[PDB]
Amino acid sequence: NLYQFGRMIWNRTGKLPILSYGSYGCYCGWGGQGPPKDATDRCCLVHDCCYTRVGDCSPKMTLYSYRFENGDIICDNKDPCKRAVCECDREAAICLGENVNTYDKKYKSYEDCTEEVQEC
Ligand SMILES: [Ca+2]
Protein backbone atom coordinates (compact mmCIF):
# COMPACT_ATOMS: atom_id res chain seq x y z
CA ASN A 1 0.00 0.00 0.00
CA LEU A 2 0.95 3.69 -0.32
CA TYR A 3 1.80 4.00 3.37
CA GLN A 4 4.60 1.43 3.13
CA PHE A 5 5.87 3.10 -0.04
CA GLY A 6 5.78 6.35 1.91
CA ARG A 7 7.83 4.83 4.73
CA MET A 8 10.39 3.60 2.20
CA ILE A 9 10.81 6.97 0.50
CA TRP A 10 11.31 8.61 3.90
CA ASN A 11 13.96 6.09 4.91
CA ARG A 12 15.91 6.50 1.65
CA THR A 13 15.46 10.22 0.96
CA GLY A 14 14.78 11.68 4.38
CA LYS A 15 11.95 13.90 3.13
CA LEU A 16 8.22 14.00 3.88
CA PRO A 17 6.85 11.64 1.18
CA ILE A 18 3.78 13.48 -0.12
CA LEU A 19 4.70 17.13 0.46
CA SER A 20 7.99 16.81 -1.43
CA TYR A 21 6.94 14.37 -4.16
CA GLY A 22 3.15 14.57 -4.19
CA SER A 23 3.24 17.00 -7.11
CA TYR A 24 6.82 16.86 -8.36
CA GLY A 25 7.59 17.03 -12.07
CA CYS A 26 5.36 15.38 -14.67
CA TYR A 27 5.16 11.93 -13.14
CA CYS A 28 5.45 12.05 -9.35
CA GLY A 29 1.96 13.43 -8.79
CA TRP A 30 -1.09 11.48 -9.98
CA GLY A 31 -1.23 10.73 -13.66
CA GLY A 32 1.67 11.82 -15.82
CA GLN A 33 2.68 12.72 -19.36
CA GLY A 34 5.35 14.67 -21.21
CA PRO A 35 9.14 14.52 -20.72
CA PRO A 36 10.66 13.79 -17.30
CA LYS A 37 11.77 17.11 -15.82
CA ASP A 38 14.74 15.40 -14.14
CA ALA A 39 16.31 12.31 -12.54
CA THR A 40 13.86 12.33 -9.62
CA ASP A 41 10.96 12.81 -12.06
CA ARG A 42 12.32 9.92 -14.13
CA CYS A 43 12.20 7.75 -11.01
CA CYS A 44 8.45 8.49 -10.79
CA LEU A 45 8.07 7.62 -14.48
CA VAL A 46 9.54 4.14 -14.09
CA HIS A 47 7.33 3.56 -11.02
CA ASP A 48 4.25 4.44 -13.11
CA CYS A 49 5.22 1.97 -15.84
CA CYS A 50 5.92 -0.55 -13.09
CA TYR A 51 2.36 -0.16 -11.82
CA THR A 52 0.76 -0.72 -15.22
CA ARG A 53 2.38 -4.14 -15.60
CA VAL A 54 1.06 -4.94 -12.12
CA GLY A 55 -2.58 -4.83 -13.20
CA ASP A 56 -3.95 -7.97 -11.53
CA CYS A 57 -2.92 -6.77 -8.08
CA SER A 58 -4.07 -3.48 -6.54
CA PRO A 59 -0.79 -1.47 -6.55
CA LYS A 60 -1.97 1.29 -4.21
CA MET A 61 -3.78 -0.98 -1.75
CA THR A 62 -1.86 -4.27 -1.95
CA LEU A 63 -0.38 -5.07 1.45
CA TYR A 64 3.01 -6.73 1.09
CA SER A 65 5.88 -7.94 3.24
CA TYR A 66 9.13 -6.03 3.35
CA ARG A 67 11.94 -5.82 5.87
CA PHE A 68 15.23 -4.07 6.55
CA GLU A 69 18.48 -6.06 6.61
CA ASN A 70 21.57 -4.01 7.50
CA GLY A 71 19.95 -0.91 6.02
CA ASP A 72 18.83 -2.64 2.83
CA ILE A 73 15.18 -2.99 1.86
CA ILE A 74 14.21 -6.57 1.05
CA CYS A 75 10.93 -7.81 -0.40
CA ASP A 76 10.29 -11.27 1.06
CA ASN A 77 6.89 -12.24 -0.34
CA LYS A 78 5.99 -15.59 -1.89
CA ASP A 79 2.94 -14.12 -3.63
CA PRO A 80 4.06 -12.98 -7.13
CA CYS A 81 1.62 -10.07 -6.95
CA LYS A 82 2.54 -8.59 -3.58
CA ARG A 83 6.20 -9.22 -4.39
CA ALA A 84 6.06 -7.44 -7.74
CA VAL A 85 4.28 -4.46 -6.15
CA CYS A 86 6.87 -4.39 -3.39
CA GLU A 87 9.73 -4.35 -5.91
CA CYS A 88 8.07 -1.43 -7.72
CA ASP A 89 8.11 0.67 -4.56
CA ARG A 90 11.56 -0.52 -3.48
CA GLU A 91 13.13 0.44 -6.82
CA ALA A 92 11.47 3.87 -6.79
CA ALA A 93 12.48 4.51 -3.18
CA ILE A 94 16.13 3.77 -3.97
CA CYS A 95 16.06 5.81 -7.18
CA LEU A 96 14.67 8.86 -5.35
CA GLY A 97 17.32 8.49 -2.68
CA GLU A 98 20.14 8.37 -5.23
CA ASN A 99 18.98 11.65 -6.80
CA VAL A 100 17.91 13.57 -3.72
CA ASN A 101 20.99 15.70 -4.38
CA THR A 102 19.57 17.23 -7.55
CA TYR A 103 16.11 17.62 -6.03
CA ASP A 104 14.74 21.07 -6.89
CA LYS A 105 11.52 22.32 -5.29
CA LYS A 106 11.05 24.43 -8.41
CA TYR A 107 9.74 21.35 -10.19
CA LYS A 108 6.51 21.38 -8.24
CA SER A 109 5.90 25.00 -9.32
CA TYR A 110 7.23 24.98 -12.89
CA GLU A 111 6.29 22.16 -15.26
CA ASP A 112 6.47 21.67 -19.04
CA CYS A 113 4.68 18.36 -19.60
CA THR A 114 4.01 17.86 -23.30
CA GLU A 115 1.33 15.51 -24.68
CA GLU A 116 3.71 12.72 -25.71
CA VAL A 117 3.21 9.42 -23.87
CA GLN A 118 6.61 8.15 -22.73
CA GLU A 119 8.29 4.77 -23.15
CA CYS A 120 7.45 1.93 -20.74
CA1 LIG B 1 2.39 9.40 -11.55
Question: Resolution of the experimental model in angstroms, please?
Answer: 2.6
> What count of other Cβ atoms lies within 10 Å of the Cβ of residue 100?
15
Does the annotation count 89 as an active-site position? Answer: yes
Is 41 an active-site residue?
A: no
HSE at residue 52, side-chain half, CA atoms within 13 A, is 10
Method: X-ray
Phi (first) and psi of residue 80, to 5 degrees: -50, -35
Residue 56, Cβ density class (10 Å: 0-12 exposed, 13-18 middle, ≥19 buried): exposed
Q: How many CA atoms lie within 13 A of 31 on its CB side?
A: 6
Distance CA(22)–CA(29), nearest Å, equals 5
From the CA of 75, how far away is ligand 1's center (Å)?
A: 22
Write the DSSP assignment of 64-77 as a string of letters.
--EEEETTEEEE--
Q: Does domain 1-120 have CATH number 3.30.70.380?
A: no
Give the distance (Å) from ligand 1 centre to CA of residue 92. Answer: 12
